[PDB]
Design a protein around this ligand. Structure first.
Ligand SMILES: CCCCCCCCCCCCO
Ligand SMILES: CCCCCCCCCCCCO
Ligand SMILES: [Zn+2]
Ligand SMILES: [Zn+2]
Ligand SMILES: [Zn+2]
Ligand SMILES: [Zn+2]
Lengths: 630, 630
């Protein structure tokens, strides 16, 4: 069968254990999530200009009765329902948020003559919808300032839904961001982007239905709205430790926390309302030190210290703490306790992972040994809905010691598809393997089953009996999973094992923000080494609009670029505005028209740039993950 | 049997293949390594003040005839012999090096009135021995300036063998380093230090004899001298991009390359001799993007660009290039070609790893797919003696995508000791497993054997037949290994499987260089969470000599420290000079004597600091690696 199966007796037992172990009697979040509600629109259906749907919430109606479903981890089901508390809310005097219009929240702070807005959602249509709700309930005001709390797309993505370049150019609107914003907004998504985006189909469960045996939540929100990605450059940067500014009569203290949840990030303290906006440093979950879709590892230590710094500066005196995801927390004692526990959560993960590592516990063991102490374990905002204790501990370890467990048995490993046939042969052939795996499956040993049956799938990818058993076991693990990313991954893997990978199949703002060096670095990543072999060429590239020059050198099957250097011996010198190069790579203009408009100029050998571009390859999106390359 | 076995017919075949595939007819390095030889002392035996031996070379006599030994990869054997070309050499007019007195080289540059010395070896006795050889052959001169090329112990470790603090304090001697030196010298060795040092016993093969079936070389040198680690703070830092200075009449151009082989590193150009000293950016091997002992991953991209920057600034005009490890290369065309190929080597590894990753190739596959192009493959200085193509490719991948392969079968893995019993049961029990593994072994399938028999060892660690077969297969892989670290790891693992882990079992300068925040971070890593559970305490710590204050807070089984903060509600306030705290942790003084000298003062509850220290645990050095914890 290729449809989801019911939860097994073991999965059911696992859900009852969760209820036994976690403080469900602490229901305070349900009152917190509804506090200050001004309007929850009856439905939410947000549409893009091209007619697609940006966002949605009706697919989540199954969650509304609050009835526990054994195909959902009851802790995750609690979070899933809390994330359904959407609409326009009051946080404090003159501070509002729109939650559940997208993955993130959008915040509106009343200035004397209009709004200061913190963050802008993922896509213009969701930001625009949030702004329309605000205007309907609170009266229309102009937006005078937009603040990006940090350099992630679920925060800057929707800016064009709120403001247009002409307003930024007139000085009608300011855009404020932490120093480092523009680099950080783009960099981490580029060089390994195709890998990350494909792997993210698992994390986000993009092929799963919304429902009890599909996608149910995404921890820091319901999921991510779909539509155009926009981005407008900051007009003012908050530098150094932070800054105190007054915006439209309202005092703001900005505290930079670079290198925590994002390389460019800042907390916001509002002294008049005693309101502490913790950016994405403190949300209603354990966050990722390592995003499963693939990314650099984050620094739990700095993360912990910056929360401590915010505690000692503001926690002190805060009457409400709130954030760019999830709901606020009111009352000084509560705020102090949340700050301490989150400081100690990232600190414990860091320190105790290292403590174990220093005792010989490896990257292949640490998640099965490290456990939070009761005081940290027993808070809802410490649960692993988004990050997990397990995958965070391995990330800390990977950060300090790397991927290699120190045992040379594992130093030069055969690819899984190359050892798989022998594992199957040693276990008696596929039928014998299946027979023993089915018995293990019947004992509820799903974490073992998915490991060993994965061998048979990699050896025999067209063995439907193996794919089906492996899917079944993954699905049970997904049902059991507290972490929304783990759930979506397990169910996505089960889906592809059962059905196969899909065979049927801008952003201009994002490209414009990309540094030219990084762009060239990306082109080097696209280079087909087979095509490049034995070639050598060099091109002086001049970009007059941005006043940069690059020297491009292809040699030894590698593309180099160097800023600020030109070579008297380059084979060709090309001049093109960066704006026009961008139009080229986005196919908004032809090379030929550009030459004819005198917008692309060349001296030397006219053919080299075309030769170089002719060597650049492309990446297919839907690569195989749960089987070897087909 | 528990003694090394001869190379198998397959290993022998593997060595003949190496000879077929690599340009052994290119013997130019042998003339390069002997060029400018002034004196090769007949023996080298260097002793420490405590009577130990620092260094070694007589144990390498087996290599001297140049006869190929089938238990050594012939490429590694070539390198091993080249690294035996030790003594005092002329590089250019007034530029000398002592090579083979330690892992690194020490360089002596003739000033008008004494020496400028670049780097200082690992330990004072080896630096002192190098200096004595210099004085014997070239005449005694004072050392007026010491330059640290970068922040690694094999470069700063021996400084006290050359100069003493009193000379630095009088201004008789200057010590020059790249900005960032003092942080970088210490930081990366602290938090996970016990893990790294134990794992390094494998990489360095510290338990192996010197000989054809033991340790033969360490790629960038013969091995590391053993003795006290010294460190003296720089008196002048090279900031920004670099600087041009004149030292004792000699012009120097310093080019910083932060974040390449070390976070603080600089190339040196000497315009009068047209001599280019490439720090540890370019040595006679592919270097590590990831050191197997365990470390953060390095940035191949920046590494590649900085070599390109040095090429375009100096390569241009260089008549000799030399380095802090291995031998020089003379002649402009040769220098230009080495710089290009090394730039493209790190660039190819970076770009092509990402190219593959973007196609779906995972961290578990990439090393079995990525291969250098011929132009890079066919140079001796590109061979993987120190770094490897294989482990570097996985590191690039780990850096961008992390440890997780995207396949949820592997998302929540059982520890090896917990799945091992089932692997053994599925394969028919230990005897059946051994039977099939011995047949695979007889086919020379050593990379498979070590994977599968490792399962049986982890299930049954006292199964001597399994340990013995696993050792045999690892040993063959070690014989075959071109990489000196891989060889030493494989033979070390074989040694422990056969014999067991050893059951019989300062640096004051290094501690003094450690930032106080990092020291406190380390103490938090030592915290026993079991002992800390349920406790809360806070201590204001004041360190008057360095004019720093810290707030220490223990809560939620985590130790926090915050620089520059004090709390009016701390339970205790302690004042102690940092110098004295250091003496305490190095047991050079008692807490009690310090109090009695008025060097440790307290107000508030006098017991808290002792309570905190009482919760701090210790790490055993000899943890198990090739078996589960005993
Ligand atoms: C194409 C795969 C669709 C999944 C969306 C993944 C993009 C994540 C960016 C938003 C989160 C920012 O931290
Ligand atoms: C205690 C284990 C002995 C092995 C020595 C490992 C220390 C490496 C430091 C020297 C290399 C600097 O990059
Ligand atoms: Zn974010
Ligand atoms: Zn976010
Ligand atoms: Zn080094
Ligand atoms: Zn070195």
């Amino acid at each position: 069968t290729t449809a989801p199966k019911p939860p097994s007796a073991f999965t059911v037992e696992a859900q009852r254990r969760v209820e036994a172990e976690l403080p469900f009697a602490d229901r305070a979040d349900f009152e917190r999530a509804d506090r200050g509600l001004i309007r929850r629109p009856e439905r939410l259906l947000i549409r893009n200009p091209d007619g697609s749907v940006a966002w949605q919430l009706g697919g989540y109606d199954f969650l509304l009765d609050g009835k526990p479903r054994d195909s959902i981890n009851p802790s995750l089901q609690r979070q899933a329902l809390l994330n359904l508390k959407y609409g326009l809310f009051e946080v404090a005097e003159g501070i509002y948020q729109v939650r559940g219009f997208d993955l993130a929240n959008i915040t509106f702070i009343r200035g004397d003559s209009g709004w200061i807005v913190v963050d802008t959602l993922t896509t213009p249509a969701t930001a625009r919808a949030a702004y329309e709700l605000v205007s309907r309930e609170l009266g229309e005001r102009p937006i005078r300032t937009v603040i990006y709390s940090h350099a992630h797309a679920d925060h800057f993505g929707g800016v064009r839904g709120l403001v247009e370049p002409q307003q930024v150019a007139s000085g009608a609107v300011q855009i404020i961001a932490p120093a480092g914003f523009m680099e950080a907004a783009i960099k981490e998504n580029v060089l390994a982007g195709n890998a990350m985006m494909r792997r993210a189909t698992y994390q986000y469960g993009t092929q799963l239905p919304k429902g009890p045996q599909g996608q149910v939540d995404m921890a820091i929100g319901k999921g991510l709205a779909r539509g155009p990605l926009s981005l407008l450059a900051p007009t003012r940067l908050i530098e150094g430790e932070g800054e105190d500014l007054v915006l439209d009569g309202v005092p703001f203290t900005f505290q930079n926390t670079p290198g925590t949840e994002s390389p460019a990030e800042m907390n916001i303290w509002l002294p008049r309302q005693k309101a502490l906006l913790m950016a994405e440093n403190v949300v209603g979950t354990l966050h990722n030190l390592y995003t499963l879709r693939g990314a650099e590892v984050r620094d739990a230590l700095g993360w912990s210290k910056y929360i401590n710094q915010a505690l000692h500066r503001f926690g002190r005196q805060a009457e409400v703490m709130f954030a760019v995801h999830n709901w606020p927390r009111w009352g000084n004692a509560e705020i102090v306790e949340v700050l301490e526990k989150q400081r100690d959560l990232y600190g414990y993960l860091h320190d105790q992972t290292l403590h174990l590592a220093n005792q010989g516990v490896t990257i292949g063991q640490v998640h099965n040994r490290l456990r939070l102490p009761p005081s940290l374990d027993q808070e809802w905002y410490d649960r692993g809905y988004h990050g997990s204790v397990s995958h965070n501990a391995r990330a800390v370890l990977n950060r300090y010691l790397g991927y290699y467990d120190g045992n040379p048995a594992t130093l030069d490993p055969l690819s899984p598809e190359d050892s798989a046939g022998r594992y199957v042969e040693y276990m008696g052939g596929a039928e014998r393997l299946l027979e023993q795996a089915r018995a293990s499956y019947a004992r509820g040993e799903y974490r073992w089953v998915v490991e060993v049956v994965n061998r048979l799938v990699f050896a025999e990818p067209d063995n439907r009996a193996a794919r089906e058993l492996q899917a079944d076991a993954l699905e049970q693990l997904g049902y059991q999973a507290e972490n929304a990313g783990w759930r979506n991954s397990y169910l996505s893997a089960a889906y592809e094992l059962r059905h196969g990978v899909p065979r049927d199949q801008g952003s201009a703002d994002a490209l414009a923000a990309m540094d030219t060096g990084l762009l060239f670095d990306y082109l080097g990543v696209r280079l087909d080494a087979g095509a490049a072999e034995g070639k050598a060429l060099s091109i002086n590239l001049r970009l007059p609009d941005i006043g940069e020059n690059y020297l491009l050198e292809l040699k030894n099957s590698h593309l180099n670029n160097l800023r600020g250097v030109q070579s008297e011996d380059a084979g060709q010198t090309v001049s093109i505005d960066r704006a026009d190069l961008n139009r080229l790579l986005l196919k908004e203009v032809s090379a030929v028209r550009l030459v004819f408009e005198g917008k692309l100029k060349s001296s030397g050998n006219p053919l080299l740039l075309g030769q170089l571009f002719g060597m650049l390859g492309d990446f297919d999106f839907w690569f195989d993950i749960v089987t070897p390359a087909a």
